[PDB]
Design a binder for this molecule. Sequence first.
Ligand SMILES: COC1=C(OC)C(=O)C(C/C=C(\C)CC/C=C(\C)CC/C=C(\C)CC/C=C(\C)CC/C=C(\C)CC/C=C(/C)CC/C=C(\C)CC/C=C(\C)CCC=C(C)C)=C(C)C1=O
Lengths: 96, 73, 315, 116, 66, 117, 341, 100, 173
Amino acid sequence: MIMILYWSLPMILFILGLFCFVSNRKHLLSMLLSLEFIVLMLFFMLFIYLNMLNYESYFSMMFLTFSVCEGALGLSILVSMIRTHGNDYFQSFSIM
Amino acid sequence: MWFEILPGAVIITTLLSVPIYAMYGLDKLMIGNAFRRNMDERFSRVMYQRDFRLTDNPYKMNGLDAIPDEKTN
Amino acid sequence: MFYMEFILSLIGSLLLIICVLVSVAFLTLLERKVLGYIQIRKGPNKVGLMGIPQPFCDAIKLFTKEQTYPLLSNYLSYYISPIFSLFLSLFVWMCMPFFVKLYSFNLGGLFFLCCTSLGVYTVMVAGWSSNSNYALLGGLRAVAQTISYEVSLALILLSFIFLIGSYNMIYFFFYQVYMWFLIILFPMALVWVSISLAETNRTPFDFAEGESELVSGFNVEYSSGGFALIFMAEYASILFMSMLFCVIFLGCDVFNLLFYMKLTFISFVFIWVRGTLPRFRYDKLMYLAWKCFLSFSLNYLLFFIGFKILLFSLL
Amino acid sequence: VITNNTTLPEESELNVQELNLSSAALRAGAFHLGKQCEQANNEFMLCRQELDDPRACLAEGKAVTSCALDFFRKVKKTCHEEFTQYATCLDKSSGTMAFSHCRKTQGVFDKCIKDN
Amino acid sequence: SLLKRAWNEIPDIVGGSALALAGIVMATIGVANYYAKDGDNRRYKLGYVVYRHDDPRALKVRNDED
Amino acid sequence: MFSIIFIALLILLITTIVMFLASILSKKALIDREKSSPFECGFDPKSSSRLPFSLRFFLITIIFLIFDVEIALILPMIIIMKYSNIMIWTITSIIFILILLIGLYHEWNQGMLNWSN
Amino acid sequence: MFNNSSKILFITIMIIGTLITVTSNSWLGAWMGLEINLLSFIPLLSDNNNLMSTEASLKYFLTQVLASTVLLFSSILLMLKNNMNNEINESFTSMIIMSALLLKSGAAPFHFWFPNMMEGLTWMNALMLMTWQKIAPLMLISYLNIKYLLLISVILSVIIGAIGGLNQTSLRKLMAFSSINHLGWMLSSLMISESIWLIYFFFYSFLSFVLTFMFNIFKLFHLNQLFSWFVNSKILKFTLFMNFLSLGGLPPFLGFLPKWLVIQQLTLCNQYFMLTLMMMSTLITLFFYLRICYSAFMMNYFENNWIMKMNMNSINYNMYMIMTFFSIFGLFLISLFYFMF
Amino acid sequence: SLTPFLRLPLTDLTGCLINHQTYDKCGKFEMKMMECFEAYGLERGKRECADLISDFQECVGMQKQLMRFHAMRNERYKQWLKGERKGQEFFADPPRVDAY
Amino acid sequence: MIQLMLYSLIITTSIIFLNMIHPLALGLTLLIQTIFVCLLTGLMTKSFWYSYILFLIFLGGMLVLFIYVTSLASNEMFNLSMKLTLFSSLILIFMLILSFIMDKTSSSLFLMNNDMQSIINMNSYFMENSLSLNKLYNFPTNFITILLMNYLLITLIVIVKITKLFKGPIRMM
Ligand SMILES: COC1=C(OC)C(=O)C(C/C=C(\C)CC/C=C(\C)CC/C=C(\C)CC/C=C(\C)CC/C=C(\C)CC/C=C(/C)CC/C=C(\C)CC/C=C(\C)CCC=C(C)C)=C(C)C1=O
């Protein structure tokens, strides 16, 4: 099928990104590491679709701007994490 | 005594100028043309395909002699 | 024909590689002679004939000397970091404009920005891999350098780019045919050299090495093999960045001989400055980039956005 | 997408004498060539834009190539030496085949064509 | 005053903003000048542009000298 | 590209050979428990280098991520100046650089650009 | 909008973010608005005086980031196969979009994060989360037309939303489970129309807008505090708590009218079986509301006696009393409303 | 394309985000189809736009043609692996580079 | 051809990335992949302009998280997994074998490279990125860029407020 010969690989890569975002690693940063991994794969598919259009790749910039802000915001929340808990370990948070 | 510096500067000046003056030499010896075609624009690339097809060598030029001189009409 | 074309491209890169690798050896001698003359010293004068074979006389030692296997270092990372430091130094040369084509490189100006940023990881990984207090301080002193110069670097490149119309470096030649952009861009030339120093981590911005603050910076735990490549990779950066100043502000007549008389002179300037200024303070640089340079660079984008607009109406 | 009922002209019709003249040789005569075949060119290029069917502009295309081939026969008849020097220079002077370098030899040709 | 304090503390932002202010001004001249010449209609066109003699655009062909 | 990748590999091989020569050409002597000890001015080290290294430019560190992503939007300017509407291009570009300056001066005045103290 | 000029901004940018989503004529445009909304809420939500608040700022961020990420994943996939923002016949690719949106709003199967982040929010924060943040997600689900997936969420929402709430004593955590149930009614109202949903949402926000103030004005966070809470006139305290009954949708009060119009339309559309499970499960929701009214309906209590006085903010209380009055007498104004016909 | 319920002025902001109307092989194909959606409305349009949607999808998504192409290649390989072809004459004469 | 080998490597590096635990091991894996994805994207496009931008953008994020990794997760451990090295190396060669015996006219992506375009396409003879990036700064889509600007500036106000610089540095107490 068309979807299997052309769009399978990025999707299989995407789900592997999510399975990193949920696996049990001690440090919160392990979530941030896997966060921009997924974003890297989202860019890849979005770039497939935008190129089916002849001239629409400019929207890649729009996507990248929101990619950094969620990473940048994701990093700020970690900073605020440290200065109330002292450490970023997942097991240090109240389970609720 | 400021002369003693110059031997250092002469060598660096010469060595860094070897490449560009070498390829200008090699291209003439090996292409027949000093400069290689510039694939900077679609039109340049397009025509480069055209030359590579006709003569089977993009750097061998096909002057008027390739034109069929006469037509019997 | 086409099959032959790429063969020549290989030769050019190899020719450019060996020539750059040779020059950085002779640059190090030139650094010692010139820095030995600004100081009232004589400089290396005995070895061989009049000191010319000095840098080769040192390349022997740094390779007949044993590797160091630090006890607390992640050895594979510690062992590989020199490779990529040298590789990234040589690799960035493939974008240097030639009218005798070597690589097309539309968007060559960007390719500069990507490659120069990579040079920080090699310092960064080497310092952390060494697993020594000073080495780590050197690495994190180098990263903070990037946080400062990186943003202002792009903006200042953009100003030059507006003048030429494209990111292809070749166009610098055509626009600098009557005069030199140095005249139009005098403060940027002066600013650009300042950022160029940060790129190569030189006095007055010598923080990665950090000599006399850190014992030897991120190099403190390297020896014969690794340290040599770190050194050569350092001076390859100076040589290129000096050239990149010559293509932007000084004509960019790559096929003329004088261009290489100019290139060495800017290399002399880099040594000249090292023998004049004391090192900045680790924070004063980061404040300098954000408080002054970034604001300065943005101000002229308006000046050149207006000037290009005004010039566009006339032409 | 092409099916049996779609009508393509037969092979014999598409055959026609072609230039087969390299890039540098073409760029040499560009400015003098253009002033002559403009009537055919504009007629051909106009239809191709409004009407985007290659088979529809088949007739006009043959006019364009004939005019080009017609021009060079004249050049072959008179300025053969000069044109080759201009083309050779234009080819071997820069990687872009820019006109800005070969102004001198260009002058030699322009005087040949305006005297003949 | 204010002018003095900045001119003494951060002279670059004053000089830099002085040229920045120059950009807006001579950007306002050039932009107005652009539509004072009808520069949307440019005598040299990218691509091979051919009009019919009856097309409305065919009237607006900018007629220049060189 | 494909030309550049090949030379990228070829260079990497060449530079790799250089230490592979150095590793053999290097004089070889028995490694001592002290020879491979870290360097910390000749006195044994109190603290591993892998302890948490405090940070003071964290705030600038985040601002650096942002300011770059606006470099992605200024760079295309030149490329599309010949092809765009001059009012839209002129207006938008200016209110792009004023926004950046205003943001910078705002934080500079608020003292965020200064390091943690 | 309580402390500094900065809080004023984040509130507005939240409004802009939500509006961009619900006014966007394409998935990609809609997704952008969600990102705008994301960072408008976090700074409002994070306060370092509380060890709990920063934890709340986390769970929301990880959940929402994943939701928008998966949401964008499917939207790209959706128009990779159809080449349109719309799918002619709904299939799996459209289901995936629905799953993300439900998680974005904390519907039943993916609600877990939602109560578990309510421990460390101020009351004014919970209102922004409970009411406004559910606009953009639920409003996009109106575009997608999968029945069974949407239907399953309703059935689980009312069930999990009710049974879970019986065991809580923290009012903030209790209201979360209460809000999950009302969310179930929306999605049920969303497979039939939107005008009902728009009406029903407005009333739901109205009641929650009221109950939040009463806790917010008197800073109550636990059931025990209700009994210890001091009021001059036990008649007054008795009447304030009569808003819970409206939140339970009892017909003598205004809070039933919303439930009522959702049944007159679901029944009109023959969804009889759904209403049985929903309306029946609402009783359990009505239960723990009465557990709160234990502190009001009985009206002589053993209370601590180091307070004789009520200290309350005027403007909040001034607006709260007005809102409460309609919450008890708002039924006779159904004549005026002309949005149901 | 989706229809916002709100349709406040904000929709003007993001309406023209992604389109096919800028120098595309399917610019005319989509305008007809989407026009028909405007004439009949969204829900009813999905039942009257059978041709326009299929044509537009076969112009952008191109599945209909790519999925012809593999049938040709696979059927070329199937013949050879069955011995019905030969190694010497596996492929047809290639097209001229200066074409397409 | 290298496109398939790029497919193999991006898959291979993703398998291991699922198994990294040490944050720097994750970072090195991610950095390597950011190179390949950047390379791969430019294959199926009229220019590599976006690969340059993407590469530049992510490298900014690469440095910053090392600064925080070196402050938060400094003391952690690696473990060479002989299961992993064999598994990746086993499949990697296996995948590389297929790419040599693949009908790699079929595997090529249908997206039109610049050369894949016709010769008649008049719009393909302009600057490499003129048209594509054009309407990023023309009516009406320009307002989207403007909207980002506030969004980015408003973000710049969010970090300082979340961060609360004045209450100290960051240490992994
Ligand atoms: C007392 O107060 C003071 C201080 O306080 C302590 C100071 O710190 C200082 C500090 C001074 C400085 C920082 C000065 C700058 C110097 C340094 C940072 C480091 C010192 C080293 C140098 C200057 C030497 C420079 C060169 C290197 C380090 C090596 C670089 C690598 C090189 C040259 C190799 C290049 C590669 C090539 C292929 C070139 C061509 C061929 C060869 C080399 C091959 C050689 C031989 C063979 C292959 C054998 C073949 C044989 C056969 C076939 C038979 C001063 C001055 C001071 O006064």
